[PDB]
Amino acid sequence: HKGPIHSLTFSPNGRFLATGATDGRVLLWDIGHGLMVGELKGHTDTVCSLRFSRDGEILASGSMDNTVRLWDAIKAFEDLETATGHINLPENSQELLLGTYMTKSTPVVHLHFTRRNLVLAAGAYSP
Amino acid sequence: WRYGPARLWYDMLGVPEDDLLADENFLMVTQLHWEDDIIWDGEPWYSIFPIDNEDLVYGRWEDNIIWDAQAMPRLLEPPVLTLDPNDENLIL
Amino acid sequence: LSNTVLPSESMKVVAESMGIAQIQEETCQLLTDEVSYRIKEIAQDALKFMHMGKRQKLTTSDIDYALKLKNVEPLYGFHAQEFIPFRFASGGGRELYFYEEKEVDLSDIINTPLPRVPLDVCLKAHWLSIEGCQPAIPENPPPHELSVEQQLYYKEITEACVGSCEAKRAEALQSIATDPGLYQMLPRFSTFISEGVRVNVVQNNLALLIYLMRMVKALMDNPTLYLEKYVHELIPAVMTCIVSRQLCLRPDVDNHWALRDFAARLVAQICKHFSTTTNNIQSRITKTFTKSWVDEKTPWTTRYGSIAGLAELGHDVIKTLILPRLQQEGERIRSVLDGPVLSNIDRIGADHVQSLLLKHCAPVLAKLRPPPDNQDAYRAEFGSLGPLLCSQVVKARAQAALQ
Amino acid sequence: SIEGCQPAIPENPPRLKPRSIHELSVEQQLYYKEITEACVGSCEAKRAEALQSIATDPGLYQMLPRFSTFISEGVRVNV
Amino acid sequence: PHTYIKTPTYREPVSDYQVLREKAASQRRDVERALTRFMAKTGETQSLFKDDVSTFPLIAARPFTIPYLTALLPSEL
């Protein structure tokens, strides 16, 4: 990262881990081999909320940019099973991003998936 | 000027602003047939103004034209209109 | 870029509030790299209450939570609604800034109008996205100068020649050609045309260039307006339509060839009506065409444009410009009759150049040769120009019979 | 030299903006008017000098378009 | 004088209020006539006389959905 990490989440199968910092960036890591397997660079302000899905389908990320973006937790994680230390990451944040979902002047402090994959949030509406 | 003349092109652009080579061959006498020129009583008004337009006389218009589209000395530019008064008999 | 600290001359001023008369410059440097070090440690720890308590504003209760964290005594009186005022004092050599605090009678704070009572925190639920895009509920985000008469006339006439339909275009060109008072709108039309022909380099639109050349041809037919003062703008636009190389978006199927001979006829008219010996329009147009034609490395499209303009100028021009370089036809037929490279575009342009050359050089051969012309084609280059000349003599005989 | 300038006698070798100034001078324009009004031959001595003046003025270039146009236009409306 | 004389004079401007009023009036009348004939020819047209499009063409009356907005509102302000 290039800023203080303010959000963390685990993928529900246990293989992965996603962080977020004040630079407005979500970095996906692999726990089994400590390599950054992705980089999600859509946001603008501090990503203060991160949550995967309930089965691991999508990744949701709310920030102080007043957005709730839904990424793809399948297209970025197709290394499931190197001896080099690198994975040769391209830039692919148009085939990973799915929605933008601006909110009315309110940051997204919390993100939550129910037992049915239904996103909840938490506002603190500040005009 | 974005709202000035040629605005439609600016709107489409989306710009954010606002020995045969010798002159003797090209001499008028060589290219002009005198008998055709004579009226011979058969049925003027050129350069009536004492000063001919300076822009045509001293302007390097040939340089503005680009022979090759692929290679251009100057890349596409806003080219904002000068809006400088010209001609005579203008109301203002 | 560098480590920024408070100025060393700000510590001499502070040391005289204390009573210290003379403080040396190595002591002042020792003071200001410590106090600017402790400012950066409370600037960055106030930012940890601005981020963890999600605020993005850095209120003054963030610094007071960080001074409480560094054990240092709090700063009293910075939660009231104030701002940043400063008052300059000029003086007789001592320049400074101060506060200029004000007073208020005590009974005018006991009898102030009270603000309204605050509300308690409550919750509100609303849909942000319903299986797709956001709903349109109000909790979401919402999603010298031309007179007006001639400004409207300029707008309608220019937007009629952009290509929505052909009939409005024909009526707009018949307006431009046949109205009496279109002066005071001639510089706008010249600017529009020249910039629109320039905008062909970003988008190689053949159709809009044909429309702009028909706009110039309509501007020339107006008897009332005199284009002498604005011809220096319209000459290089028509020249750009003649001698540029990519006039097409799909080079193979677009007939850039017609915008070539149409603009060549246009420039022959523009140097018939306006060439004066003070102007030197025609000599300067022939010189550009000539040094574009005689010079090698030029593409077949721009050579086609050069030959087309030179051959529309007249008969004596093709006598003294085209006819010396008739041997160049052999260099052309090098790449036409002969060559495995067949599926390139250098064949359609070459035999277009050939057809234009022999069509225009057939009456020139009919003017300066014998009437028989038995093996003039064999004497000619490739023996084809001579066949065209025989056809031209036959056509002239037919015209004489018609007369 | 006349106060620094060499004369051209035959004993010598060689949005509001201001209006344009004619390259031809008002002495030159008055000279053109006098020479053309003398060359229409009201008086013969006037013609003959004006003809000699045309025949040996060194600075008669840069006035020559207006003389050629006056000749050409004249013959066509004079036939 | 021709030997060494140069008169850098300006150009006599037009201060005739009569001909300036005439020029501005006739140019305004001609541009509004050209505009109205162009707009009557490229749209629906009416006519005071039977089959009269060349001489006196009228732009046809179109109804507005909200007519007070085009009536009462000022356009130059």
From Swiss-Prot, chain A:
It is found in: Nucleus. It comes from the Eukaryota. WD repeats lie at residues 1-39, 42-81. Homodimer. Component of the TFIID basal transcription factor complex, composed of TATA-box-binding protein TBP, and a number of TBP-associated factors (TAFs), including TAF1, TAF2, TAF3, TAF4, TAF5, TAF6, TAF7, TAF8, TAF9, TAF10, TAF11, TAF12 and TAF13. The TFIID complex structure can be divided into 3 modules TFIID-A, TFIID-B, and TFIID-C. TAF5 forms the TFIID-A module together with TAF3 and TBP, and in TFIID-B with TAF8. Component of the TFTC-HAT complex, at least composed of TAF5L, TAF6L, TADA3L, SUPT3H/SPT3, TAF2, TAF4, TAF5, GCN5L2/GCN5, TAF10 and TRRAP. The TFIID basal transcription factor complex plays a major role in the initiation of RNA polymerase II (Pol II)-dependent transcription. TFIID recognizes and binds promoters with or without a TATA box via its subunit TBP, a TATA-box-binding protein, and promotes assembly of the pre-initiation complex (PIC). The TFIID complex consists of TBP and TBP-associated factors (TAFs), including TAF1, TAF2, TAF3, TAF4, TAF5, TAF6, TAF7, TAF8, TAF9, TAF10, TAF11, TAF12 and TAF13. The TFIID complex structure can be divided into 3 modules TFIID-A, TFIID-B, and TFIID-C. Belongs to the WD repeat TAF5 family. This is Transcription initiation factor TFIID subunit 5. The gene is TAF5.
Curated annotation (Swiss-Prot), chain C:
It comes from the Eukaryota. One of its GO terms (molecular function) is protein heterodimerization activity. Keywords: Apoptosis, Disease variant, Intellectual disability, Isopeptide bond, Methylation, Nucleus, Phosphoprotein, Transcription, Transcription regulation, Ubl conjugation. Coiled coil: none annotated. GO terms for cellular component: cytosol; MLL1 complex; nucleoplasm; nucleus; protein-containing complex; SAGA complex; SLIK (SAGA-like) complex; transcription factor TFIID complex. It is found in: Nucleus. GO terms for biological process: apoptotic process; DNA-templated transcription initiation; mRNA transcription by RNA polymerase II; negative regulation of cell cycle; negative regulation of cell population proliferation; positive regulation of apoptotic process; positive regulation of DNA-templated transcription; positive regulation of intrinsic apoptotic signaling pathway. The keyword Transcription applies. The modification Phosphoserine is found at residue 194. The modification Phosphothreonine is found at residues 112, 178. Its main location: nucleus. The modification Phosphotyrosine is found at residue 183. Component of the TFIID basal transcription factor complex, composed of TATA-box-binding protein TBP, and a number of TBP-associated factors (TAFs), including TAF1, TAF2, TAF3, TAF4, TAF5, TAF6, TAF7, TAF8, TAF9, TAF10, TAF11, TAF12 and TAF13. Interacts directly with TBP, TAF1/TAFII250, TAF9/TAFII31 and TAF12/TAFII20. The TAF6/TAFII70-TAF9/TAFII31 heterodimer forms an octamer complex with the TAF4B/TFII105-TAF12/TFIID20 heterodimer. Belongs to the TAF6 family. This is Transcription initiation factor TFIID subunit 6. The gene is TAF6.
UniProtKB/Swiss-Prot annotation, chain D:
It comes from the Eukaryota. The modification Phosphothreonine is found at residue 56. The modification Phosphotyrosine is found at residue 61. The modification Phosphoserine is found at residue 72. It is found in: Nucleus. Component of the TFIID basal transcription factor complex, composed of TATA-box-binding protein TBP, and a number of TBP-associated factors (TAFs), including TAF1, TAF2, TAF3, TAF4, TAF5, TAF6, TAF7, TAF8, TAF9, TAF10, TAF11, TAF12 and TAF13. Interacts directly with TBP, TAF1/TAFII250, TAF9/TAFII31 and TAF12/TAFII20. The TAF6/TAFII70-TAF9/TAFII31 heterodimer forms an octamer complex with the TAF4B/TFII105-TAF12/TFIID20 heterodimer. It is linked to Alazami-Yuan syndrome: An autosomal recessive syndrome reminiscent of Cornelia de Lange syndrome and characterized by delayed psychomotor development with intellectual disability, hypotonia, microcephaly, short stature, poor speech, and dysmorphic features. Belongs to the TAF6 family. This is Transcription initiation factor TFIID subunit 6. It comes from Homo sapiens (Human). The lineage of its organism: Eukaryota, Metazoa, Chordata, Craniata, Vertebrata. The gene is TAF6. The chain holds residues 137 to 271 of 677 of the full protein.
Swiss-Prot record, chain E:
It comes from the Eukaryota. Induction: Induced with triglyceride accumulation. It is found in: Nucleus; Cytoplasm. Belongs to the TAF8 family. Component of the TFIID basal transcription factor complex, composed of TATA-box-binding protein TBP, and a number of TBP-associated factors (TAFs), including TAF1, TAF2, TAF3, TAF4, TAF5, TAF6, TAF7, TAF8, TAF9, TAF10, TAF11, TAF12 and TAF13. Interacts with TBP, TAF1, TAF6, TAF10, TAF11 and TAF13. Component also of a small TAF complex (SMAT) containing TAF8, TAF10 and SUPT7L. Forms a heterodimer with TAF10. Interaction with TAF10 is mediated mainly via its histone fold domain while interaction with SUPT7L is via its C-terminal region. The TFIID basal transcription factor complex plays a major role in the initiation of RNA polymerase II (Pol II)-dependent transcription. TFIID recognizes and binds promoters with or without a TATA box via its subunit TBP, a TATA-box-binding protein, and promotes assembly of the pre-initiation complex (PIC). The TFIID complex consists of TBP and TBP-associated factors (TAFs), including TAF1, TAF2, TAF3, TAF4, TAF5, TAF6, TAF7, TAF8, TAF9, TAF10, TAF11, TAF12 and TAF13. The TFIID complex structure can be divided into 3 modules TFIID-A, TFIID-B, and TFIID-C. 'Taube nuss' means 'empty nut' in German.
